[PDB]
Amino acid sequence: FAINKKAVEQGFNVKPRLNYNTVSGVNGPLVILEKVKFPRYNEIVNLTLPDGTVRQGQVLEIRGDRAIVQVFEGTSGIDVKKTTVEFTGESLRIPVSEDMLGRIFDGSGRPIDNGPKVFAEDYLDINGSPINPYARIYPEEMISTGVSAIDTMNSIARGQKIPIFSASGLPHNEIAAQICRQAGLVREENFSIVFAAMGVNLETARFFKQDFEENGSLERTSLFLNLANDPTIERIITPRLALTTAEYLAYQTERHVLTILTDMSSYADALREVSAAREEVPGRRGYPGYMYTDLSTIYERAGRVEGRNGSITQIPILTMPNDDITHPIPDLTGYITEGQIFVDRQLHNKGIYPPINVLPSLSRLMKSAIGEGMTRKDHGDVSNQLYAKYAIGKDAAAMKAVVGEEALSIEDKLSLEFLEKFEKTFITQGAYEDRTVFESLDQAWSLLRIYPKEMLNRISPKILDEFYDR
Amino acid sequence: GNFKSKLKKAMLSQQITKSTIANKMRLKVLSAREQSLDGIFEETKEKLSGIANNRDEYKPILQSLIVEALLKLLEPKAIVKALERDVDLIESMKDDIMREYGEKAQRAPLEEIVISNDYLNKDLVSGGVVVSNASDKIEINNTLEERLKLLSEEALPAIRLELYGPSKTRKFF
Amino acid sequence: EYGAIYSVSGPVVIAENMIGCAMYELVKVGHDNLVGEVIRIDGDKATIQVYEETAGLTVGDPVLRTGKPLSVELGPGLMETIYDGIQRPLKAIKEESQSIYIPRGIDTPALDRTIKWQFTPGKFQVGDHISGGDIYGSVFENSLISSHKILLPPRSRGTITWIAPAGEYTLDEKILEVEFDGKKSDFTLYHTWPVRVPRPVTEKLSADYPLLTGQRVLDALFPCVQGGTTCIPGAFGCGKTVISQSLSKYSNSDAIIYVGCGERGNEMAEVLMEFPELYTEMSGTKEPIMKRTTLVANTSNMPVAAREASIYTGITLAEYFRDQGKNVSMIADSSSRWAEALREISGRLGEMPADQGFPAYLGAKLASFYERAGKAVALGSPDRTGSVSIVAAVSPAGGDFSDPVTTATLGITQVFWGLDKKLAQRKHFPSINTSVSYSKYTNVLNKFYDSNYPEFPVLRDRMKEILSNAEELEQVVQLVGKSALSDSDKITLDVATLIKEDFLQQNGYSTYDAFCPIWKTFDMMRAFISYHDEAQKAVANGANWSKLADSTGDVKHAVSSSKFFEPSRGEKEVHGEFEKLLSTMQERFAESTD
Amino acid sequence: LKEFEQKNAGGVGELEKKAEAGVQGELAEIKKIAEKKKDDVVKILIETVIKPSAEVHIN
Prior knowledge:
The structure is cut from a larger assembly and holds chains A, B, C and D.
Chain A: H1 3-8, E1 18-20, E2 25-27, E3 30-32, E4 44-48, E5 54-63, E6 66-71, E7 84-87, E8 95-96, E9 104-106, E10 122-123, E11 136-137, E12 140-143, H2 148-153, E13 156-158, E14 164-166, H3 172-181, E15 192-200, H4 202-215, E16 221-227, H5 232-235, H6 237-253, E17 256-261, H7 264-278, E18 282-284, E19 287-288, H8 291-299, E20 304-305, E21 311-314, E22 317-319, H9 328-336, E23 341-342, H10 346-349, H11 366-369, H12 379-403, H13 410-426, H14 437-448, H15 461-467
Helix pairs in contact in A: 12-13, 12-14, 13-14
Chain B: H1 2-52, H2 55-73, E1 77-81, H3 87-104, E2 112-115, E3 130-133, E4 138-141, H4 144-154, H5 156-164
Parallel strand pairs in B: 1-2
Antiparallel strand pairs in B: 1-3, 3-4
Helix pairs in contact in B: 1-4, 2-3
Chain C: E1 3-9, E2 12-15, E3 25-29, E4 34-42, E5 45-50, E6 62-69, E7 71-74, E8 82-83, H1 90-97, E9 116-120, E10 128-130, E11 135-139, E12 148-151, E13 158-163, E14 167-170, E15 176-179, E16 185-187, E17 191-194, E18 203-205, E19 210-211, H2 216-220, E20 224-225, E21 230-233, H3 240-249, E22 256-263, H4 266-277, E23 293-299, H5 306-322, E24 328-331, H6 335-349, H7 362-371, E25 374-377, E26 385-394, H8 404-410, E27 415-419, H9 422-425, E28 432-438, H10 442-452, H11 457-480, H12 487-502, H13 511-514, H14 518-540, H15 545-552, H16 555-562, H17 573-593
Parallel strand pairs in C: 8-23, 21-26, 21-27, 22-23, 22-24, 24-26
Antiparallel strand pairs in C: 1-2, 1-6, 2-5, 3-4, 3-6, 4-5, 7-17, 9-11, 9-14, 10-13, 11-12, 13-15, 15-16, 18-25, 19-20, 25-26, 27-28
PDB class: motor protein
Keywords: proton pump, rotary motor enzyme, motor protein
Entry title: CryoEM Structures of Reconstituted V-ATPase,State2
């Protein structure tokens, strides 16, 4: 109890900071100082324009009495005679407290809800340290979402980094809204949700706010809003702040935290912007040849620790800017993040909400997540048979489109019928409709029963004998 | 369909109302805490103003302030800007600091000090000093009020810990 | 010497007053004595690569030399132990610091200084003459391995003066004192060795003994041999983990060094507790398996530099063990991440890159790294022999599958295992591509086959020809469907489909879904080829193939279920079932042949 | 529909007390603890402000 006193005893310690006026060169988002008396690497500074406005920035590289500062919030109106730059001797920090729940912060982590300052219990370096893998708990405890497709073919365990691959003009926002509306486990504690909004438009923000107010979950959540009308440079910081806050909450309060990272595309764009001016070697498509490491740093910050009940699950939102999967961003993400959720376009074109195509999607952790005691043992082989039948229906329809029904065998017609029934009754569900995993299994068995006992080959004899009938 | 829509609307109205109420309550609580902190800061400013008015206390404290500023600057020359009514003690301790700068360091003592012929607004600061490089390009502010402002945020976690005791919800620190 | 941190830029540091140093010498930097390496010499200024984070540094900070290259410790306690990229026990660090994080600058001995090991004098006595790399006594380590031999480090010889007696000794205690030209050498249990220098050896030798893996297809079509390399390219979710688990849990290797560089980490979070309980009765009923393999991990969040040092550490340890004669096989997560690190560090240095932005010396790096492997005769008076195999994966994501890393790898590899992706969406595993893959060891493995399975080699050619015909025929199926197919063509199509479904699937986890011995695979070869040839012959002699298949019927189910047998049922019951299945199928064909 | 609406129109009035009753407790408790610790905080703050320090940079 008193250990907090021991930690914070250093607080009553005041150290001054030098005021430099030595602007020696500036080119866009870079400023150069001189004779700066042993500057620390990657620390923070504050700028006072002659008008009387305060900006912020950090040092990026240092040589003998020459430091390059990076200014997040613009660079216009920079003189050489009325510039006040003062160091801080530290990397940027954040006022952290459990109190922030129910608060709304800008992209710079400042209240924008007409509220006062929050009396933080501590401060943290925005960037974190890697966790020893020796103290990592492998995921378990499958998570319900009220959505047939995910809960039936791509089940999710507590603690997981899985992206959503969508394209422009898709309801991904609404999908996430439903997911947070239908959180929880089938086997409780209401989830604590962190939302990181970077480079978005007003309508999306207002939609999310109204959704949270409607569900009432707002009171156990907080937001970081960064729009398209704000400096790009600072845009890369918001995910770091959100992740640090999630770390604090989960691993110092033992809370189950759900994080919704939005528009990784914009984050990658900002990375490329900053790298281009820095003149780094372009790895591919202009993106620097090391952004993979940054993505790893962002994504590998999730899991379960040995002695911490609290858990953090990351669901970043990714938009491929070609309606393509070969784009570098999703490729690296797939190399990084276990599990993945794809989003269909034809189903949306066919007005089938939620438009999802299971086949490209994959969950690399659903194996252990499912099992006996949480679901009937058939669930897995049922899903496998569903995959087989679905793929057979797809390619059978494709080949029929060339030859037609005349060259089709009966099993082809069965595949087409199963495909149509599946895609028009099973996957589809209303905006406020949820299904238990067992109900989903019932639907899957009912649809499968169209075929006879023999065609089902991905199922062991006993499972067929036990579940082929009602 | 109209009934279902209206029922959803009623749910929205109730949720909006309750969320607004919760926000108002939390804002009021936090504002009250802020008011308490502001009162504490007012008392601290009053204390600083009172202490600045005793030359006996002001002399050694001022000397230590200037010594710290110089030991930060590490320069063979320096300039000092302060209030006109404080120049007396500065002139008193000029030589003392002249030797102390080197004493704390291991190089030769300082060379010279210039008292700038221009002074801060009285209302701006109750007391303190502002030290500047001989070139008047690098300067350090040790004004007591600035000291208070700087401390009012760095030490805030300990302040809140004292005011509200244990966190009661942190199980690893 | 001493110097100041003149300039810092990310993972690159520039010091001064560094005149007596040599490139690749270890150095301590910063107030926390972080580790680094020397690269460039600029008079007195030197550029240091640092294996640790930054932002705590500032101009004018102290630096220290070490007067030694980069090395790792060799001796006891290496096994069952998980280290970082620079050989630091993660568990010990965690349980000492009492923190979940990984504090920077933390330094610990590479090997425990608390265990007293049970040494016994070996083939030498007091007052002898010995040479470099000679075993002079052993020490018991584990139930699985109970004789950890101890030998002089290379480049050391002379006449020994005294040998220690048996008993319990901590590794730090001297046990042998030698006189080359004077008593200037006393040797404890363990020692160290510079990573960059491959360890010596008596002489290289050919490698012909097959390397078993249990996987049906690999041992069938593209076998791997003890001593030699193999690349496994593919994208995410390509079953690479499946092959890793299979080869780790099942093999004849006398030691395994699993290496994880730029990996998900959670794979560690699963395997670590999976590994020990996955008991395997190697060397008889010896349940423990973690004694069969160590593991060094290097997650993505780790500093980039370590992602290279890890590979050198792993190869060094593998060579060290092979020096004892026990066969070894080291495994890599992805050299692609290593290439990424090399490119990033070279770019930060600023030197002009080669194609794709990669440093030109990458090819030479890979060539030497693979050259380190092979089979040879270990140096030493007892005259034992060892051998090391190697396998690694690739991460092609640049928009092709001929990226310079892949090309360089293929240039030195003998076994290639291409992987598809659609098979994953088809849930078909292993998801290898029989269309684009090859091996170069069958020629010599024919000798071993003739030793034990002389019939075996002559079957695989026809086996693969079946598939070749399958994809030669599928074209017309897409074009105009099945309109002019003869009975033989349908026979080939259907038998190839049956092969793909049954013989090309290790799916599931069971006795028959986890391992397959050589003999069971050979018998399945026999059954499949017999069925195909008999059906073709029966139709050739005159038989309506549609009618013939509809009448034969359950032959297909019988042959397919043949795989569902339990491997290792005494090699007789399974053999008897194969014999009776063959007899039944041949008789059924004979009745239905005409 | 009108009858249902009549319920959401009179809902005002209760929320006032429902919130204010709760708030007073914490308001008073914070007030009392702050009053108790005023002098201690002031003392420590003054001591810290007047604290004399003198440290050359590490380098």
